[PDB]
């Protein structure tokens, strides 16, 4: 028979998965809720059609490889992957995951969080992140819409399409031309260094998220790159000379010195109704200079989370994660083969 359909789009996951309801669209996939008739559970299914473009294929391969390699309570898993039996026939890929109730972006449109919830949410984020960082992997796109929640306050990080292995040496010129939904959560060094990605970029994003939980508005909004930077300066204040002593590329430090001086705004002024323990560590998380910026282990070990910190119940990766090749290098026809092989273990016959 014919395939199931949602908003005029083929969603070909039957007969195993039925009763599809649209949830949302990211920039890259259409997501539905569904019913798994085999396991008798509700699931989420993400439809991805990435084969016409190299960057999409890159994102898809990374997300799959990473989520399949990670197993951790605070990171969304992949339960199943549906795709055609031959490579020529494969035009879409469906990723099946546990169905969560909402994301933190949606939640915050509708309500204000009690300090307890914020605290617990923050703990879970950092717990997931510690795990991710232990494998020397950086998420690089943490933001409220990537934090899935349910009504019991369980939280899971999703969306690893931009993840990569931590390397102090890679060039930034991709990953800026490439589209993301927001940018309000990007560390300043991403914008003004010319080389590399470090674990500190994820921490900055966590800081931006904490701020957002406290006030229900993004702390560093902005429309384009220079505008964005201005918002950060207008709060943290113009950078110290020691701050301009770093990986900051010149033509950025000159741009910085070019700027009219700005005064720091005290945290308690921006967030009057915020637990003081939270504003400390918010400060430690949103520091302009990556080197002094608090690390994930330390952050878990800050007073604000004291009630949750439990090094015994905070798992780490067995080993670092590795990509054999630079995915930026590969053309889309190659990535397609890699995605086909990577998904083969969910195929009926599969060898090993």
């Amino acid at each position: 028979a014919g395939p199931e359909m949602v908003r005029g789009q083929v969603f070909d996951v039957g007969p195993r998965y039925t009763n599809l309801s649209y949830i949302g669209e990211g920039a890259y996939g259409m997501v539905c809720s569904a019913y798994d008739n085999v396991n008798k559970v509700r699931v989420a299914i993400k439809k991805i059609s990435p084969f016409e473009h190299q960057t999409y294929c890159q994102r898809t391969l990374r997300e799959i490889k990473i989520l399949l390699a990670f197993r951790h309570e605070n990171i969304i898993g992949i339960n199943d992957i549906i795709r055609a039996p031959t490579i020529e026939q494969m035009k879409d890929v469906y990723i099946v995951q546990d169905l969560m109730e909402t994301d933190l972006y949606k939640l915050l449109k509708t309500q204000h969080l009690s300090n307890d919830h914020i605290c617990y949410f923050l703990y879970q984020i950092l717990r997931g992140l510690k795990y991710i960082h232990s494998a020397n992997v950086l998420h690089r796109d943490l933001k409220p819409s990537n934090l899935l929640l349910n009504t019991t306050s369980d939280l899971k990080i999703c969306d690893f399409g931009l993840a990569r292995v931590a390397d102090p040496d890679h060039d930034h010129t991709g990953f800026l031309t490439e589209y993301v939904a927001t940018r309000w959560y990007r560390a300043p060094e991403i914008m003004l260094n010319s080389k590399g990605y470090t674990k500190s970029i994820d921490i900055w994003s966590v800081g931006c998220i904490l701020a957002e939980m406290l006030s229900n508005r993004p702390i560093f909004p902005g429309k384009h790159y220079l505008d964005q930077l201005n918002h950060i300066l207008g709060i943290l204040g113009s950078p110290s000379q020691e701050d301009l002593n770093c990986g900051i590329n010149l033509k950025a430090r000159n741009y910085l010195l070019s700027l009219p001086h700005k005064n720091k705004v005290p945290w308690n002024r921006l967030f009057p109704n915020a637990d003081s323990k939270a504003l400390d560590l918010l400060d430690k998380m949103l520091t302009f200079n990556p080197h002094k910026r608090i690390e994930v282990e330390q952050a878990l070990a800050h007073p604000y989370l004291a009630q949750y910190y439990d090094p015994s119940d905070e798992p780490i990766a067995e080993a670092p994660f590795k990509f054999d090749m630079e995915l930026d290098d590969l053309p889309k026809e190659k990535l397609k083969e890699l995605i086909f092989e990577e998904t083969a273990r969910f195929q009926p016959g599969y060898r090993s």
Binding site: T102, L107, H117, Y120, T151, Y308
Partner: peptide
């Protein structure tokens, strides 16, 4: 004694 509860949230 692991999981902290914590009143339920209401989701639209």
């Amino acid at each position: 004694r692991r999981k902290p509860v914590l009143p339920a949230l209401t989701i639209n």
